[PDB]
Amino acid sequence: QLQARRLDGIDYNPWVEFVKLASEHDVVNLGQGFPDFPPPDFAVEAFQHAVSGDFMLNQYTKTFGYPPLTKILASFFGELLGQEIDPLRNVLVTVGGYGALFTAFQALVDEGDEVIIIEPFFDCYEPMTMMAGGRPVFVSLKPGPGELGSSSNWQLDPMELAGKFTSRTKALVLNTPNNPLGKVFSREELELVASLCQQHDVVCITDEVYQWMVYDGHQHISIASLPGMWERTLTIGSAGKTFSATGWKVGWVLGPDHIMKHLRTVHQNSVFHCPTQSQAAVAESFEREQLLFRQPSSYFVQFPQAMQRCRDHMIRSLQSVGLKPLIPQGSYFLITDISDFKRKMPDLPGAVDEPYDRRFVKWMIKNKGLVAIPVSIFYSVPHQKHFDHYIRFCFVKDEATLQAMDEKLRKWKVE
Amino acid sequence: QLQARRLDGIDYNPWVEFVKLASEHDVVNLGQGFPDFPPPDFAVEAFQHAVSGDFMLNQYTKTFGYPPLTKILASFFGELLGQEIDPLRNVLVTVGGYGALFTAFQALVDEGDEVIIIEPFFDCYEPMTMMAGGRPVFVSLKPGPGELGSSSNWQLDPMELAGKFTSRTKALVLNTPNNPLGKVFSREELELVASLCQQHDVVCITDEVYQWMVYDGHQHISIASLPGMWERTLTIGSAGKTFSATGWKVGWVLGPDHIMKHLRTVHQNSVFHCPTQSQAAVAESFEREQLLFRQPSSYFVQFPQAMQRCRDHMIRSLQSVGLKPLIPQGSYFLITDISDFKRKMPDLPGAVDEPYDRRFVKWMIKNKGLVAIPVSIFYSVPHQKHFDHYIRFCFVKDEATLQAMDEKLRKWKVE
Ligand SMILES: Cc1ncc(COP(=O)(O)O)c(CN)c1O
Ligand SMILES: Cc1ncc(COP(=O)(O)O)c(CN)c1O
């Protein structure tokens, strides 16, 4: 009654509980979706230049983005997407990917609109939809029939997905690479989505914040580069998962002017400007990578290699303690199946109707010194029952952290 | 129909037209609401430390604010307000003042709620209200009966204001010091507001971004420090008008936990984190001013003095060319009456029903080389008729700019 009704149902963050519990224990924190090592020098220095350079960089820049930034964005991405991008009609700099999604949702979703959300989903898609009046409609990625599983096996059933589409569908949220699962969507997959999107006349909000984090030579493809798609796609990116600098909270949406004009309205009536210097830092950082694009010394070459090693490493460590990793094709993350623990250990302490994985994560923090994340926080509540056996790990960590993980794991193992 | 209805009516920015026109002319730009000189060294350096220091400052900080920042905020402001402030329940770091208002509105205002907006208003109060479903209800500050006018004479009529209050009033937006007028609200004024707010049970969203910019020894008072008010006040501030670094876009709301918990919900479903380093810069900057609070070398002492000089200077320059300045008690701004021009020059070129001051500003850009802002952009459309004779100037400028103004003014004067 004092609060607006749009807040109904979206006030609880299941995250918190656990950060609170992790901090009152000695832990290796693998629930954190960000590096614990420095960003690349070129990028840190880029920031250092922006705050040490032309003094007017401390004052306001342009509303829809700091032009050196929109410039490089439209160029580098226009090339990557295969698309002509006007910085002033097709690019909006936002407060991180979070900002971009929020802007997108507040633009497009209205009382009654349905949004198709693919499980597992980055958790904020559902609240944002709900805050905007929309109705989330869920479809589950479904793992197909080795012990080690693979992200690319998780399947978007063409009949199931076609069925979610109604006359009320405003948008489908497609996040690739997927967090938490790590799925990198295939071309044939994308096309499935593009095709139903094209058919029912529906916007594809597409969150590609993890674009650069790809492994095993799977290749990131943007639905926006598919024939006919640019006219109905909003592509989101984030400097923070680009340059391993999450704290910079700089993101953008790329999209056709007739959609963007609304994302702009929300922007000009919400935050109006993004801060200047960080934008400057990002613009420089992109210039550096575009200059060296594909080159061996380029960050987008070295980094995915480095983190693949981290992935591989974590995958082996966790494997031998009973956890059942699903190899990810990209993202900061891997999930592991814990169903073996559920059979061996069915009755762990927690609330009635609390999903197993949350109970399990809480256990492991207390006793084994390791933080992970209950995958069920990325499912519709109706679906947490059936999907209460995964946990999510972040392998974008320092060697010293992977060592500590190993220590924790070896100590646990004697059991 | 593709866009959400909340965007109805809020898509047009009357600002733009003029920036476009100013850039295709040789101008002294006094429509810009920000310095064109560097921030204080301590503050620029503070940023330089934050991006050059502990590398993990590049990663995510806490959701509701970077603790060194919420810490210093709660301390410095708790002292200034006379109030006990818990950083974690009473402070939210937002993306500038703009962010804070947006968060406040999306928290509290809902289909049907009325918001009382005092004219002239910072323009974004009306769209934000409208986007949230609310109904703006306007009351006009009204200048009381020398040639030079004064901001403090503009009056909030106690009967007029009491009359705006209905059972549907959710909030009243109080902005002091006022932009554009420069009014610094008096204690007796505040109390009027507090008292009706207290009576009808209504939140006072109070925008004090200009807190530090006060002149002639008028004193900034926060409605939040009035008896009984903290329980129904949200106070907004902005690092950018604090440290003359608008481009940093760091703001905050201070307020009682039972309100803030909703501002938090919006925050955690919109931007989630504010960027770390800038927060760090601000936290340091405040530490520096709090240490030297009231001291002669403190920025909050030196700066208002400096800008008072700039004010005084501009007031005299514009005075002698026929403009009729209203001395401001604070803010970055002064408005001048242009009714003499309207009598001398009634028929200037523009759209039918375009207010005089907009037509006039456009004229002055083209012919006299000076940018200002039509005050009518800060009135309800119904009220722009009667209030089409002011323009707004920003005197927070370098000497070299005030010189250029003078050049433009002297050249004009020969006429
Ligand atoms: C899938 C996904 N999309 C969007 C975001 C938004 O993050 P940020 O605002 O820091 O860019 C995140 C969180 N990093 C994410 O993992
Ligand atoms: C009255 C008023 N309030 C709030 C704001 C918001 O500005 P910012 O977001 O940069 O803090 C402004 C613009 N400076 C303003 O003048």
Side-chain angles (χ1 to χ4, degrees), chain A residues 157-186:
Chain A
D157 184 90
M159 199 179 345
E160 241 148 86
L161 171 73
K164 300 307 169 158
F165 275 83
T166 92
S167 59
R168 265 112 147 304
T169 299
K170 182 130 280 159
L172 165 158
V173 180
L174 154 72
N175 162 218
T176 188
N178 188 281
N179 165 18
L181 165 55
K183 196 205 211 304
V184 180
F185 268 62
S186 77

PDB file of all heavy atoms in Angstrom, chain A residues 157-186:
ATOM      1  N   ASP A 157      13.602 -27.907 -27.014  1.00  0.00           N
ATOM      2  CA  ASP A 157      12.694 -28.734 -27.801  1.00  0.00           C
ATOM      3  C   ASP A 157      11.868 -27.904 -28.791  1.00  0.00           C
ATOM      4  O   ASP A 157      11.109 -27.032 -28.380  1.00  0.00           O
ATOM      5  CB  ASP A 157      11.767 -29.508 -26.862  1.00  0.00           C
ATOM      6  CG  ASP A 157      10.854 -30.468 -27.600  1.00  0.00           C
ATOM      7  OD1 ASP A 157      11.283 -31.625 -27.787  1.00  0.00           O
ATOM      8  OD2 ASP A 157       9.718 -30.159 -28.031  1.00  0.00           O
ATOM      9  N   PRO A 158      11.988 -28.142 -30.092  1.00  0.00           N
ATOM     10  CA  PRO A 158      11.297 -27.250 -31.043  1.00  0.00           C
ATOM     11  C   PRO A 158       9.761 -27.188 -30.836  1.00  0.00           C
ATOM     12  O   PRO A 158       9.200 -26.099 -30.936  1.00  0.00           O
ATOM     13  CB  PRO A 158      11.720 -27.793 -32.416  1.00  0.00           C
ATOM     14  CG  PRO A 158      12.992 -28.567 -32.125  1.00  0.00           C
ATOM     15  CD  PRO A 158      12.768 -29.189 -30.781  1.00  0.00           C
ATOM     16  N   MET A 159       9.118 -28.302 -30.481  1.00  0.00           N
ATOM     17  CA  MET A 159       7.675 -28.308 -30.247  1.00  0.00           C
ATOM     18  C   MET A 159       7.253 -27.581 -28.960  1.00  0.00           C
ATOM     19  O   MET A 159       6.266 -26.810 -28.969  1.00  0.00           O
ATOM     20  CB  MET A 159       7.156 -29.733 -30.213  1.00  0.00           C
ATOM     21  CG  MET A 159       5.662 -29.861 -30.426  1.00  0.00           C
ATOM     22  SD  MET A 159       5.097 -31.608 -30.399  1.00  0.00           S
ATOM     23  CE  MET A 159       6.738 -32.568 -30.593  1.00  0.00           C
ATOM     24  N   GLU A 160       8.000 -27.830 -27.876  1.00  0.00           N
ATOM     25  CA  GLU A 160       7.794 -27.181 -26.587  1.00  0.00           C
ATOM     26  C   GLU A 160       7.868 -25.658 -26.714  1.00  0.00           C
ATOM     27  O   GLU A 160       6.998 -24.914 -26.206  1.00  0.00           O
ATOM     28  CB  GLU A 160       8.878 -27.616 -25.628  1.00  0.00           C
ATOM     29  CG  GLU A 160       8.441 -28.344 -24.366  1.00  0.00           C
ATOM     30  CD  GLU A 160       9.513 -29.359 -23.929  1.00  0.00           C
ATOM     31  OE1 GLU A 160      10.483 -28.946 -23.187  1.00  0.00           O
ATOM     32  OE2 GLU A 160       9.400 -30.564 -24.351  1.00  0.00           O
ATOM     33  N   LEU A 161       8.918 -25.205 -27.398  1.00  0.00           N
ATOM     34  CA  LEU A 161       9.178 -23.796 -27.592  1.00  0.00           C
ATOM     35  C   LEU A 161       8.140 -23.136 -28.479  1.00  0.00           C
ATOM     36  O   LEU A 161       7.652 -22.069 -28.143  1.00  0.00           O
ATOM     37  CB  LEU A 161      10.582 -23.599 -28.125  1.00  0.00           C
ATOM     38  CG  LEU A 161      10.945 -22.184 -28.576  1.00  0.00           C
ATOM     39  CD1 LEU A 161      11.134 -21.251 -27.383  1.00  0.00           C
ATOM     40  CD2 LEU A 161      12.199 -22.216 -29.464  1.00  0.00           C
ATOM     41  N   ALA A 162       7.774 -23.776 -29.591  1.00  0.00           N
ATOM     42  CA  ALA A 162       6.723 -23.241 -30.469  1.00  0.00           C
ATOM     43  C   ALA A 162       5.444 -23.054 -29.685  1.00  0.00           C
ATOM     44  O   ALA A 162       4.705 -22.081 -29.891  1.00  0.00           O
ATOM     45  CB  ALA A 162       6.468 -24.160 -31.632  1.00  0.00           C
ATOM     46  N   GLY A 163       5.190 -23.999 -28.784  1.00  0.00           N
ATOM     47  CA  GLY A 163       4.000 -23.946 -27.961  1.00  0.00           C
ATOM     48  C   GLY A 163       3.896 -22.786 -26.975  1.00  0.00           C
ATOM     49  O   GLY A 163       2.786 -22.451 -26.555  1.00  0.00           O
ATOM     50  N   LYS A 164       5.024 -22.186 -26.590  1.00  0.00           N
ATOM     51  CA  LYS A 164       4.996 -21.100 -25.618  1.00  0.00           C
ATOM     52  C   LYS A 164       4.494 -19.835 -26.262  1.00  0.00           C
ATOM     53  O   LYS A 164       4.068 -18.903 -25.583  1.00  0.00           O
ATOM     54  CB  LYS A 164       6.378 -20.856 -25.035  1.00  0.00           C
ATOM     55  CG  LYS A 164       6.956 -22.051 -24.326  1.00  0.00           C
ATOM     56  CD  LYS A 164       5.995 -22.548 -23.304  1.00  0.00           C
ATOM     57  CE  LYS A 164       6.406 -23.891 -22.769  1.00  0.00           C
ATOM     58  NZ  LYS A 164       5.762 -24.079 -21.440  1.00  0.00           N
ATOM     59  N   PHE A 165       4.564 -19.799 -27.585  1.00  0.00           N
ATOM     60  CA  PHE A 165       4.250 -18.606 -28.337  1.00  0.00           C
ATOM     61  C   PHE A 165       2.769 -18.467 -28.464  1.00  0.00           C
ATOM     62  O   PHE A 165       2.077 -19.408 -28.884  1.00  0.00           O
ATOM     63  CB  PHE A 165       4.881 -18.686 -29.702  1.00  0.00           C
ATOM     64  CG  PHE A 165       6.295 -18.229 -29.726  1.00  0.00           C
ATOM     65  CD1 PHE A 165       7.309 -19.076 -29.372  1.00  0.00           C
ATOM     66  CD2 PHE A 165       6.614 -16.936 -30.100  1.00  0.00           C
ATOM     67  CE1 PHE A 165       8.649 -18.643 -29.407  1.00  0.00           C
ATOM     68  CE2 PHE A 165       7.930 -16.499 -30.129  1.00  0.00           C
ATOM     69  CZ  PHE A 165       8.955 -17.363 -29.784  1.00  0.00           C
ATOM     70  N   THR A 166       2.289 -17.302 -28.043  1.00  0.00           N
ATOM     71  CA  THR A 166       0.880 -16.925 -28.133  1.00  0.00           C
ATOM     72  C   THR A 166       0.831 -15.513 -28.722  1.00  0.00           C
ATOM     73  O   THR A 166       1.881 -14.881 -28.944  1.00  0.00           O
ATOM     74  CB  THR A 166       0.145 -16.936 -26.738  1.00  0.00           C
ATOM     75  OG1 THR A 166       0.217 -15.626 -26.143  1.00  0.00           O
ATOM     76  CG2 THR A 166       0.831 -17.856 -25.709  1.00  0.00           C
ATOM     77  N   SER A 167      -0.383 -15.013 -28.932  1.00  0.00           N
ATOM     78  CA  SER A 167      -0.557 -13.688 -29.458  1.00  0.00           C
ATOM     79  C   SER A 167      -0.097 -12.638 -28.459  1.00  0.00           C
ATOM     80  O   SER A 167       0.049 -11.479 -28.814  1.00  0.00           O
ATOM     81  CB  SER A 167      -2.009 -13.450 -29.847  1.00  0.00           C
ATOM     82  OG  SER A 167      -2.894 -13.621 -28.743  1.00  0.00           O
ATOM     83  N   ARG A 168       0.148 -13.039 -27.215  1.00  0.00           N
ATOM     84  CA  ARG A 168       0.521 -12.076 -26.203  1.00  0.00           C
ATOM     85  C   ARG A 168       2.034 -11.955 -25.971  1.00  0.00           C
ATOM     86  O   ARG A 168       2.488 -11.155 -25.145  1.00  0.00           O
ATOM     87  CB  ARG A 168      -0.239 -12.359 -24.915  1.00  0.00           C
ATOM     88  CG  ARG A 168      -1.477 -11.527 -24.830  1.00  0.00           C
ATOM     89  CD  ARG A 168      -2.760 -12.344 -24.938  1.00  0.00           C
ATOM     90  NE  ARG A 168      -3.910 -11.827 -24.158  1.00  0.00           N
ATOM     91  CZ  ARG A 168      -3.926 -11.589 -22.825  1.00  0.00           C
ATOM     92  NH1 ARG A 168      -2.829 -11.805 -22.071  1.00  0.00           N
ATOM     93  NH2 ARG A 168      -5.052 -11.127 -22.253  1.00  0.00           N
ATOM     94  N   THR A 169       2.805 -12.738 -26.715  1.00  0.00           N
ATOM     95  CA  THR A 169       4.252 -12.788 -26.545  1.00  0.00           C
ATOM     96  C   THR A 169       4.837 -11.471 -26.990  1.00  0.00           C
ATOM     97  O   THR A 169       4.733 -11.138 -28.166  1.00  0.00           O
ATOM     98  CB  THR A 169       4.827 -13.918 -27.416  1.00  0.00           C
ATOM     99  OG1 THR A 169       4.272 -15.166 -27.005  1.00  0.00           O
ATOM    100  CG2 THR A 169       6.299 -14.108 -27.174  1.00  0.00           C
ATOM    101  N   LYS A 170       5.438 -10.701 -26.096  1.00  0.00           N
ATOM    102  CA  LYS A 170       6.155  -9.529 -26.572  1.00  0.00           C
ATOM    103  C   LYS A 170       7.602  -9.824 -26.933  1.00  0.00           C
ATOM    104  O   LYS A 170       8.118  -9.363 -27.940  1.00  0.00           O
ATOM    105  CB  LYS A 170       6.088  -8.370 -25.600  1.00  0.00           C
ATOM    106  CG  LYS A 170       6.798  -7.165 -26.162  1.00  0.00           C
ATOM    107  CD  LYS A 170       5.971  -5.912 -26.104  1.00  0.00           C
ATOM    108  CE  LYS A 170       4.935  -5.748 -27.193  1.00  0.00           C
ATOM    109  NZ  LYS A 170       3.848  -4.760 -26.739  1.00  0.00           N
ATOM    110  N   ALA A 171       8.260 -10.610 -26.106  1.00  0.00           N
ATOM    111  CA  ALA A 171       9.708 -10.795 -26.220  1.00  0.00           C
ATOM    112  C   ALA A 171      10.096 -12.217 -25.812  1.00  0.00           C
ATOM    113  O   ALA A 171       9.303 -12.911 -25.141  1.00  0.00           O
ATOM    114  CB  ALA A 171      10.461  -9.744 -25.375  1.00  0.00           C
ATOM    115  N   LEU A 172      11.267 -12.661 -26.259  1.00  0.00           N
ATOM    116  CA  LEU A 172      11.842 -13.883 -25.761  1.00  0.00           C
ATOM    117  C   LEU A 172      13.231 -13.489 -25.297  1.00  0.00           C
ATOM    118  O   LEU A 172      13.931 -12.762 -26.008  1.00  0.00           O
ATOM    119  CB  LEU A 172      11.906 -14.935 -26.863  1.00  0.00           C
ATOM    120  CG  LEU A 172      12.785 -16.182 -26.670  1.00  0.00           C
ATOM    121  CD1 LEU A 172      12.288 -17.299 -27.575  1.00  0.00           C
ATOM    122  CD2 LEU A 172      14.287 -15.912 -26.888  1.00  0.00           C
ATOM    123  N   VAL A 173      13.640 -13.925 -24.107  1.00  0.00           N
ATOM    124  CA  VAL A 173      14.932 -13.491 -23.638  1.00  0.00           C
ATOM    125  C   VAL A 173      15.914 -14.576 -23.963  1.00  0.00           C
ATOM    126  O   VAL A 173      15.749 -15.690 -23.519  1.00  0.00           O
ATOM    127  CB  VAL A 173      14.962 -13.163 -22.149  1.00  0.00           C
ATOM    128  CG1 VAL A 173      16.394 -12.728 -21.785  1.00  0.00           C
ATOM    129  CG2 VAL A 173      13.975 -12.075 -21.798  1.00  0.00           C
ATOM    130  N   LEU A 174      16.932 -14.278 -24.749  1.00  0.00           N
ATOM    131  CA  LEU A 174      17.870 -15.316 -25.112  1.00  0.00           C
ATOM    132  C   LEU A 174      19.191 -14.863 -24.611  1.00  0.00           C
ATOM    133  O   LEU A 174      19.596 -13.734 -24.854  1.00  0.00           O
ATOM    134  CB  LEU A 174      17.913 -15.498 -26.615  1.00  0.00           C
ATOM    135  CG  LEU A 174      19.192 -16.061 -27.239  1.00  0.00           C
ATOM    136  CD1 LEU A 174      19.357 -17.540 -26.930  1.00  0.00           C
ATOM    137  CD2 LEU A 174      19.182 -15.807 -28.739  1.00  0.00           C
ATOM    138  N   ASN A 175      19.853 -15.726 -23.856  1.00  0.00           N
ATOM    139  CA  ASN A 175      21.075 -15.346 -23.187  1.00  0.00           C
ATOM    140  C   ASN A 175      22.109 -16.329 -23.674  1.00  0.00           C
ATOM    141  O   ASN A 175      22.030 -17.495 -23.347  1.00  0.00           O
ATOM    142  CB  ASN A 175      20.895 -15.447 -21.671  1.00  0.00           C
ATOM    143  CG  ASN A 175      22.246 -15.490 -20.903  1.00  0.00           C
ATOM    144  OD1 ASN A 175      22.388 -16.226 -19.898  1.00  0.00           O
ATOM    145  ND2 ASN A 175      23.256 -14.720 -21.393  1.00  0.00           N
ATOM    146  N   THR A 176      23.064 -15.899 -24.488  1.00  0.00           N
ATOM    147  CA  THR A 176      24.080 -16.834 -24.931  1.00  0.00           C
ATOM    148  C   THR A 176      25.380 -16.109 -25.060  1.00  0.00           C
ATOM    149  O   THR A 176      25.387 -15.003 -25.608  1.00  0.00           O
ATOM    150  CB  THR A 176      23.659 -17.588 -26.252  1.00  0.00           C
ATOM    151  OG1 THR A 176      24.604 -18.639 -26.558  1.00  0.00           O
ATOM    152  CG2 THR A 176      23.642 -16.663 -27.480  1.00  0.00           C
ATOM    153  N   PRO A 177      26.455 -16.684 -24.502  1.00  0.00           N
ATOM    154  CA  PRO A 177      26.394 -17.928 -23.713  1.00  0.00           C
ATOM    155  C   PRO A 177      25.544 -17.850 -22.423  1.00  0.00           C
ATOM    156  O   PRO A 177      25.465 -16.820 -21.761  1.00  0.00           O
ATOM    157  CB  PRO A 177      27.858 -18.167 -23.339  1.00  0.00           C
ATOM    158  CG  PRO A 177      28.635 -17.380 -24.316  1.00  0.00           C
ATOM    159  CD  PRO A 177      27.829 -16.170 -24.578  1.00  0.00           C
ATOM    160  N   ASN A 178      24.924 -18.958 -22.059  1.00  0.00           N
ATOM    161  CA  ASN A 178      24.016 -19.031 -20.911  1.00  0.00           C
ATOM    162  C   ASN A 178      24.751 -19.033 -19.584  1.00  0.00           C
ATOM    163  O   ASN A 178      25.812 -19.674 -19.438  1.00  0.00           O
ATOM    164  CB  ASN A 178      23.185 -20.308 -21.024  1.00  0.00           C
ATOM    165  CG  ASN A 178      22.089 -20.402 -19.997  1.00  0.00           C
ATOM    166  OD1 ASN A 178      22.345 -20.751 -18.841  1.00  0.00           O
ATOM    167  ND2 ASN A 178      20.841 -20.132 -20.421  1.00  0.00           N
ATOM    168  N   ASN A 179      24.198 -18.262 -18.645  1.00  0.00           N
ATOM    169  CA  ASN A 179      24.525 -18.302 -17.217  1.00  0.00           C
ATOM    170  C   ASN A 179      23.184 -18.677 -16.641  1.00  0.00           C
ATOM    171  O   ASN A 179      22.172 -17.954 -16.881  1.00  0.00           O
ATOM    172  CB  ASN A 179      24.952 -16.904 -16.727  1.00  0.00           C
ATOM    173  CG  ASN A 179      24.972 -16.739 -15.184  1.00  0.00           C
ATOM    174  OD1 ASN A 179      24.996 -17.706 -14.413  1.00  0.00           O
ATOM    175  ND2 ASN A 179      25.007 -15.484 -14.743  1.00  0.00           N
ATOM    176  N   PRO A 180      23.153 -19.790 -15.881  1.00  0.00           N
ATOM    177  CA  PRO A 180      24.346 -20.466 -15.326  1.00  0.00           C
ATOM    178  C   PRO A 180      24.986 -21.649 -16.082  1.00  0.00           C
ATOM    179  O   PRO A 180      26.094 -22.116 -15.702  1.00  0.00           O
ATOM    180  CB  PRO A 180      23.783 -21.054 -14.036  1.00  0.00           C
ATOM    181  CG  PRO A 180      22.391 -21.449 -14.415  1.00  0.00           C
ATOM    182  CD  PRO A 180      21.911 -20.453 -15.439  1.00  0.00           C
ATOM    183  N   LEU A 181      24.282 -22.152 -17.092  1.00  0.00           N
ATOM    184  CA  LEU A 181      24.587 -23.466 -17.636  1.00  0.00           C
ATOM    185  C   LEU A 181      25.883 -23.496 -18.407  1.00  0.00           C
ATOM    186  O   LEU A 181      26.574 -24.495 -18.412  1.00  0.00           O
ATOM    187  CB  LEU A 181      23.409 -23.967 -18.452  1.00  0.00           C
ATOM    188  CG  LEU A 181      23.503 -25.135 -19.411  1.00  0.00           C
ATOM    189  CD1 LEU A 181      24.033 -26.428 -18.777  1.00  0.00           C
ATOM    190  CD2 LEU A 181      22.107 -25.339 -20.013  1.00  0.00           C
ATOM    191  N   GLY A 182      26.206 -22.383 -19.041  1.00  0.00           N
ATOM    192  CA  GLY A 182      27.341 -22.292 -19.928  1.00  0.00           C
ATOM    193  C   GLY A 182      27.034 -22.693 -21.363  1.00  0.00           C
ATOM    194  O   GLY A 182      27.949 -22.780 -22.180  1.00  0.00           O
ATOM    195  N   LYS A 183      25.778 -22.959 -21.690  1.00  0.00           N
ATOM    196  CA  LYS A 183      25.441 -23.338 -23.070  1.00  0.00           C
ATOM    197  C   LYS A 183      25.789 -22.228 -24.079  1.00  0.00           C
ATOM    198  O   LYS A 183      25.423 -21.055 -23.896  1.00  0.00           O
ATOM    199  CB  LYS A 183      23.946 -23.667 -23.193  1.00  0.00           C
ATOM    200  CG  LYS A 183      23.577 -24.429 -24.472  1.00  0.00           C
ATOM    201  CD  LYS A 183      22.101 -24.205 -24.859  1.00  0.00           C
ATOM    202  CE  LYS A 183      21.443 -25.412 -25.582  1.00  0.00           C
ATOM    203  NZ  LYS A 183      22.133 -25.888 -26.811  1.00  0.00           N
ATOM    204  N   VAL A 184      26.501 -22.600 -25.142  1.00  0.00           N
ATOM    205  CA  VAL A 184      26.666 -21.675 -26.254  1.00  0.00           C
ATOM    206  C   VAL A 184      25.699 -22.125 -27.310  1.00  0.00           C
ATOM    207  O   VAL A 184      25.797 -23.253 -27.814  1.00  0.00           O
ATOM    208  CB  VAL A 184      28.071 -21.683 -26.805  1.00  0.00           C
ATOM    209  CG1 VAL A 184      28.179 -20.696 -27.950  1.00  0.00           C
ATOM    210  CG2 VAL A 184      29.058 -21.347 -25.693  1.00  0.00           C
ATOM    211  N   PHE A 185      24.741 -21.265 -27.632  1.00  0.00           N
ATOM    212  CA  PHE A 185      23.717 -21.630 -28.603  1.00  0.00           C
ATOM    213  C   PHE A 185      24.287 -21.866 -29.991  1.00  0.00           C
ATOM    214  O   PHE A 185      25.125 -21.087 -30.438  1.00  0.00           O
ATOM    215  CB  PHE A 185      22.665 -20.543 -28.693  1.00  0.00           C
ATOM    216  CG  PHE A 185      21.508 -20.753 -27.770  1.00  0.00           C
ATOM    217  CD1 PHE A 185      21.698 -20.778 -26.387  1.00  0.00           C
ATOM    218  CD2 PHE A 185      20.227 -20.903 -28.279  1.00  0.00           C
ATOM    219  CE1 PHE A 185      20.631 -20.964 -25.535  1.00  0.00           C
ATOM    220  CE2 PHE A 185      19.158 -21.095 -27.430  1.00  0.00           C
ATOM    221  CZ  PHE A 185      19.358 -21.137 -26.059  1.00  0.00           C
ATOM    222  N   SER A 186      23.822 -22.931 -30.661  1.00  0.00           N
ATOM    223  CA  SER A 186      24.276 -23.300 -32.005  1.00  0.00           C
ATOM    224  C   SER A 186      23.616 -22.456 -33.099  1.00  0.00           C
ATOM    225  O   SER A 186      22.722 -21.660 -32.829  1.00  0.00           O
ATOM    226  CB  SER A 186      23.994 -24.769 -32.240  1.00  0.00           C
ATOM    227  OG  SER A 186      22.627 -24.990 -32.521  1.00  0.00           O
TER     228      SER A 186
END
